[PDB]
Amino acid sequence: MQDCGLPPDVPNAQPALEGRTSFPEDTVITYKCEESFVKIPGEKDSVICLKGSQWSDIEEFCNRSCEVPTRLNSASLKQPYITQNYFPVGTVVEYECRPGYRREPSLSPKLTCLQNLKWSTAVEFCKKKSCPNPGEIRNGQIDVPGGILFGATISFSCNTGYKLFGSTSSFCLISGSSVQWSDPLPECREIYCPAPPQIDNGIIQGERDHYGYRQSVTYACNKGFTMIGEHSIYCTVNNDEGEWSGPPPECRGC
Amino acid sequence: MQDCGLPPDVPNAQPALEGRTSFPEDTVITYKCEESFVKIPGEKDSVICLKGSQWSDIEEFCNRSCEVPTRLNSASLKQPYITQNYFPVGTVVEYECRPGYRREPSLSPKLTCLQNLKWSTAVEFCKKKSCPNPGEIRNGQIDVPGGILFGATISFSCNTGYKLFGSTSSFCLISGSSVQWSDPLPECREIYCPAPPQIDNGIIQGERDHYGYRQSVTYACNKGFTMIGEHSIYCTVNNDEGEWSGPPPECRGC
Numbered sequence: 190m191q192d193c194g195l196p197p198d199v200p201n202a203q204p205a206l207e208g209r210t211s212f213p214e215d216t217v218i219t220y221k222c223e224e225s226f227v228k229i230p231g232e233k234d235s236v237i238c239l240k241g242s243q244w245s246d247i248e249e250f251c252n253r254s255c256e257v258p259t260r261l262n263s264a265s266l267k268q269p270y271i272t273q274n275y276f277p278v279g280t281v282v283e284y285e286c287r288p289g290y291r292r293e294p295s296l297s298p299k300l301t302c303l304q305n306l307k308w309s310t311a312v313e314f315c316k317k318k319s320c321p322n323p324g325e326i327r328n329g330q331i332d333v334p335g336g337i338l339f340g341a342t343i344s345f346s347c348n349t350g351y352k353l354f355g356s357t358s359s360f361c362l363i364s365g366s367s368v369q370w371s372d373p374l375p376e377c378r379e380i381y382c383p384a385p386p387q388i389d390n391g392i393i394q395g396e397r398d399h400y401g402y403r404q405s406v407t408y409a410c411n412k413g414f415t416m417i418g419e420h421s422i423y424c425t426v427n428n429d430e431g432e433w434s435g436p437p438p439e440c441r442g443c
Numbered sequence: 444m445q446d447c448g449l450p451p452d453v454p455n456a457q458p459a460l461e462g463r464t465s466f467p468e469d470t471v472i473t474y475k476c477e478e479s480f481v482k483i484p485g486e487k488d489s490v491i492c493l494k495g496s497q498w499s500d501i502e503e504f505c506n507r508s509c510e511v512p513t514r515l516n517s518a519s520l521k522q523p524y525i526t527q528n529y530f531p532v533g534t535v536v537e538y539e540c541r542p543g544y545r546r547e548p549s550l551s552p553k554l555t556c557l558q559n560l561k562w563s564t565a566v567e568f569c570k571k572k573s574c575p576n577p578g579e580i581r582n583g584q585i586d587v588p589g590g591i592l593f594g595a596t597i598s599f600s601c602n603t604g605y606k607l608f609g610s611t612s613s614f615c616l617i618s619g620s621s622v623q624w625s626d627p628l629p630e631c632r633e634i635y636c637p638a639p640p641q642i643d644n645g646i647i648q649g650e651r652d653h654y655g656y657r658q659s660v661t662y663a664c665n666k667g668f669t670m671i672g673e674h675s676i677y678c679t680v681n682n683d684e685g686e687w688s689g690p691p692p693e694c695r696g697c
């Protein structure tokens with residue numbers, strides 16, 4: 190009926206004594222690997238106090254191991270590395286691209302545990318996916334300030350004389366399997382000036398169905414009359430309504 | 444004696460006595476109609492001293508006449524009115540159109556000498572001839588401010604994106620028998636933008652031989668290069684030179 194003394198001394202491991210120094214038979218003491226040490230899977234990490242005041246045998250069960258690889262935005266830890274914590278020197282793990290990222294063939298998606306207990310240099314093996322080419326807007330313009338990769342933003346404009354109809358911008362969002370543009374290409378439609386005013390005792394030289402930006406209309410008085418204002422007027426617009434340069438000339442009189 | 448006294452007194456007429464008061468037989472004295480007066484055609488205007496110191500008979504030979512019809516630009520006196528100077532009250536003359544004018548049937552080409560010794564009111568019996576239809580200008584405009592009659596002036600313009608080549612105006616001048624357009628219609632030629640600049644590490648999507656107004660050129664970076672700028676630029680045509688909307692997008696980098 191004798192108690193057990195102090196547990197055996199295990200290298201790189203510290204036992205949880207619970208402030209005790211003597212333990213009754215059938216006492217199980219568990220060790221915890223020291224800093225930079227991860228318990229070797231399948232190894233005895235504890236001791237029991239047996240008859241004759243004797244502790245059960247126990248061998249070193251800790252190996253200097255890497256910390257769980259740091260999360261990456263481009264890729265994730267494949268299985269089963271994604272659930273492991275024991276990473277002794279020489280341990281290599283494999284990654285798999287996230288969404289929306291794509292594999293850079295020329296580069297390896299593997300990380301190694303260096304002697305110094307750190308993961309080998311990180312390379313861009315998982316490169317950002319690139320949305321389809323914007324295209325082109327008829328009588329409009331697309332602005333790609335920072336490429337068209339996953340996360341980029343592009344804007345749309347309408348050339349002078351045209352009003353934009355649709356989305357004014359678009360984002361390279363991730364959509365399921367691949368990547369796509371948030372909003373669709375708008376349309377740059379041609380602005381039209383309201384029918385040119387008609388004048389008393391005068392007429393419009395060759396009238397047209399519609400008048401667009403920079404388009405003019407020339408007037409002509411009737412035999413025996415005179416103008417009062419500009420002879421012609423042109424279709425203004427600016428941003429983004431169609432407007433005539435000014436009032437129409439004037440004929441008089443009789 | 445063989446002499447004559449003073450010549451008979453003729454109304455509205457004054458005789459040329461030549462400093463003398465007595466005249467020897469066979470002396471012929473001539474009278475000159477007074478102001479506002481013209482001598483009657485085919486009528487004696489002179490007396491002769493005959494035997495017995497007696498002057499030959501003489502009757503009034505001076506009316507009472509208008510003045511040579513005032514010069515007009517449209518019409519010209521007919522024959523023989525164009526050579527006459529004796530125009531007593533009631534005298535009516537006929538005109539004939541000049542070049543390039545034409546008679547206006549509805550109106551009479553005759554002028555009368557009124558009691559007040561003036562010509563009846565002048566009407567436009569000889570109107571201005573008209574010039575052929577100016578026609579039209581492909582991608583251009585013709586400005587007819589005051590009809591196209593003889594003497595009129597018309598201007599020519601070139602629609603946006605086109606440069607005028609030829610006469611910028613024309614006048615309806617008389618061409619022998621008729622009146623014709625001084626100069627021939629000009630040419631509305633299409634302005635071209637200087638060859639679109641090229642960018643480093645990029646290319647022009649489907650380059651063209653020439654670029655006209657509102658025509659654009661889309662750029663494309665080279666693999667591994669990010670396009671930073673306006674995905675495309677268009678050719679703005681400003682009165683009246685061809686210019687690119689702006690700078691071309693860029694490809695980085697390095």
Ligand SMILES: [Cl-]
Nearest residue numbers: 322323670674
């Ligand atoms: Cl692009």
Ligand SMILES: [Cl-]
Nearest residue numbers: 416418419420
């Ligand atoms: Cl005017």
Ligand SMILES: [Cl-]
Nearest residue numbers: 416419420588
């Ligand atoms: Cl005018």
Ligand SMILES: [Cl-]
Nearest residue numbers: 333670671674
């Ligand atoms: Cl681009």
Ligand SMILES: [Pt+2]
Nearest residue numbers: 416419420438
């Ligand atoms: Pt005018």
Ligand SMILES: [Pt+2]
Nearest residue numbers: 662663670674
């Ligand atoms: Pt582009």
